[PDB]
A and B are shown apart, each in its own frame.
Chain A
Amino acid sequence: QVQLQQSGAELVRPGTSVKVSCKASGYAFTNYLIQWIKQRPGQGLEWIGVINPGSGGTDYNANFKGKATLTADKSSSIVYMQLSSLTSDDSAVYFCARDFYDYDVGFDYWGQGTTLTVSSAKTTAPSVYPLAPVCGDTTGSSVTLGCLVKGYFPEPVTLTWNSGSLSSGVHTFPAVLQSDLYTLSSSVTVTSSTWPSQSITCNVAHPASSTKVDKKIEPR
C-alpha cells in the first residue's frame, strides 16, 4: 500500500522539455524526501536531485543543475521533474524514490520508472499478428504459440496474455530494432489440450500512440 507512481512513457522532440511526474500514495508525503535517479538502460544509476515536498527545498547533482528542475504539489501529492533542453543523451529510464526525512535509512520504495525516448521520429503504431501453432501438433507434452508485435516506434509496448490471468508460461522477448522501427515478439506454452479447448488472447498496448489491440490465437 505505500505506492510511488509515475508518469508513463514519452516521446520527445530534441530541444523540447518534459514534466515527468511522481505521484505518492499511502504514506505521509512530507515525512519523506523524494529523490530522482537516471538510468541509461543497460548501465548504472546516477543521482539527479532531491526535493523536500513540505518545504519546497531542491538540491541537484552539478551535472543536472539547470537541466532538471524539481517542483512539488502539496495540494495533491505529486512531485515533478521538468527536464529542460532535451538531446539524444537524455533518453533513459528516470526513477524516483522516497528517502525518510528524520533519518537516512536508504531509498525505501521506488516508482516504476518513466522511460523517456528523445527523438526526431514520428510515432508509428504496431500491427499485431496472432502466431498460431502449426498443423502436426496438439500433443507430446505441452503447447506453444505466440504474439508478433511488428512495425513500431517508440518503445514501450505492453503485451499480455489473457489480460494477466495467463501469467505462468509466457516469454516476452526484448524488443529488437530493425530499420528505425521495433519488432517485439512473445510466446506462451499452454497445456497440450487447453488452448483449442478453452481460450487465449494476446492483448497489446502501445500507450505512446493510444493503439490497443486484442488478438486471439486461433488454430489455422
Chain B
Amino acid sequence: DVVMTQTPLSLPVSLGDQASISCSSSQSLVHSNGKTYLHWYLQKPGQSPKLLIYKVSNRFSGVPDRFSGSGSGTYFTLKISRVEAEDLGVYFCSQSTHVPYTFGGGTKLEIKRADAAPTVSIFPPSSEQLTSGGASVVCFLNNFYPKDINVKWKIDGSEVQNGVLNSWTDQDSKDSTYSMSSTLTLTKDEYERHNSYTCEATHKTSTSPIVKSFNRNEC
C-alpha cells in the first residue's frame, strides 16, 4: 500500500535549535511521470491538519523559510531551522503517488523550555450546584512546565482518593506551558460534614507541596 514510516515518534526540541523529522516509504514514491509526490502536513493540537511542503521540497503559501523539505525516492526528511513555539504539533508525511493515499504515523514536536511552577486556584462549590444534591470542589493547576505534576487532595487534613477527576492540557502554543484541572465531586452532605479542603501538587520547582486550601465556613 506504500507503508509509510516516521521517526521519531516524539521529538523533544528547544526554542531556537534545529529539528529534523524523517519519513521513509516501502515503495518508490516517484510516479512514472517523473514527480515524487510526498507532502508534509502540520496538525496543531485541536486544529485540523494544514499543508506545509507540497511536492517534496516546495513550500505552501505563507510558510516560513525555516521549514524545508528534502529527499529522494524513498527517503525524505523535513527540517525546522530554529524552532519556535508555534511549531507545536504532530507532523504528518503522506504520499499521493499511489492509491490508497497513505499517511505517516506522525511525529510529536515537543518544545523544551526552562521550568515553570503552577498557579493553583481552589474553587468552592457554587451555589447553583449545592442546591442540587451534590457539591464539587474544583481546582485549576495552571501554566506549569514540565508536565509531570502530582495532585493529592486532602479533605480536613486527610488524603481523599475518590471521585477525583483530572484533566490535562496540551503544551501551549504561545508560551509552551502545560496545565491541569483536578475536580473533586462530593455529595452535598459529605461536602458539608467537613470544613477543610486542600489541593496539593508535587513537582521540581519546589520541594514542598504547592498547597492551596480553603474552609466550608465560606461566609
A and B touch in the complex (CB under 8 A): yes
Tell me the chain A residues, 67-110 only, with Cβ under 8 Å from chain B. 95, 99, 104-108, 110
Check A173–B218 contact: CB distance below 8 A: no
Q: Does B8 sit within 8 A of A, measured CB to CB? A: no
How many Å lie between the Cα of A188 and that of B45 in the bound state? 19
How many Å lie between the Cα of A176 and that of B41 in the bound state? 28
Which chain A positions have C-beta within 8 A of B121? 133, 144-145, 187
Question: In the complex, how many residues of chain A place their beta carbon closer than 8 angstroms to a beta carbon of chain B?
Answer: 44
Q: Which residue of A lies closest to B214 (CB)?
A: A134
Q: Does A62 sit within 8 A of B, measured CB to CB? A: yes
Q: Does B55 sit within 8 A of A, measured CB to CB? A: yes
Check A44–B218 contact: CB distance below 8 A: no
Which chain A positions have C-beta within 8 A of B105? 44
Check B142–A183 contact: CB distance below 8 A: no
Check B106–A129 contact: CB distance below 8 A: no
Check A113–B140 contact: CB distance below 8 A: no
Report which of A110, A131, A185 forms a contact with B49, defined as CB distance below 8 A: A110
Question: In the complex, how many residues of chain B place their beta carbon closer than 8 angstroms to a beta carbon of chain A?
Answer: 50
Check B138–A106 contact: CB distance below 8 A: no
Q: Which residue of A lies closest to B130 (CB)?
A: A129
Q: Does B148 sit within 8 A of A, measured CB to CB? A: no
Instruction: Determine how close the nearest CB of chain B comes to the CB of A7; give it in whole angstroms.
Output: 14
How many Å lie between the Cα of A30 and that of B132 in the bound state? 55
Instruction: Determine how close the nearest CB of chain B comes to the CB of A63; give it in whole angstroms.
Output: 8
Q: Does B179 sit within 8 A of A, measured CB to CB? A: yes
Report which of B35, B37, B138 forms a contact with A185, defined as CB distance below 8 A: B138
Which chain A positions have C-beta within 8 A of B119? 144, 189
Instruction: Determine how close the nearest CB of chain B comes to the CB of A26; give it in whole angstroms.
Output: 15
Which chain B positions have C-beta within 8 A of A95? 48-49
| Total inter-chain residue pairs, C-beta < 8 Å | 122
Which chain B positions have C-beta within 8 A of A111? 48
Tell me the chain B residues, 161-194 only, with Cβ under 8 Å from chain A. 163, 165-170, 179-181, 183, 185
Q: Does A174 sit within 8 A of B, measured CB to CB? A: yes
Check B101–A148 contact: CB distance below 8 A: no
Report which of B35, B100, B128, B183 forms a contact with A130, defined as CB distance below 8 A: B128
Report which of A35, A104, A131, A176 forms a contact with B37, defined as CB distance below 8 A: A104
Q: Does B126 sit within 8 A of A, measured CB to CB? A: yes
Instruction: Determine how close the nearest CB of chain A comes to the CB of B184; give it in whole angstroms.
Output: 11
> Max chain B CB contacts within 10 Å: which of A95, A108, A113, A148?
A148
Given A171-B140, A189-B142, residue A107 in contact with residue B104 (CB < 8 A): no
How many Å lie between the Cα of A111 and that of B121 in the bound state? 37
* Binary interface encoding of chain A residues 166-202 relative to chain B, with 1 for a CB under 8 A from any of its CBs, else 0: 0000010111101000010101010000000000000
Chain B interface residues (CB < 8 Å from chain A): 35, 37, 39, 41, 48-51, 54-55, 60, 92, 94, 96, 99-106, 119, 121-124, 126-129, 132, 136, 138, 140, 142, 163, 165-170, 179-181, 183, 185, 214, 218
Chain A interface residues (CB < 8 Å from chain B): 35, 37, 44-47, 59, 61-62, 95, 99, 104-108, 110-113, 127, 129-135, 144-146, 148, 150, 171, 173-176, 178, 183, 185, 187, 189, 220
Q: List 15 A-B contacts (CB under 8 A).
A: A45-B49, A45-B103, A47-B103, A104-B96, A127-B128, A134-B122, A135-B214, A146-B123, A171-B179, A173-B181, A183-B165, A185-B140, A185-B167, A187-B121, A187-B140
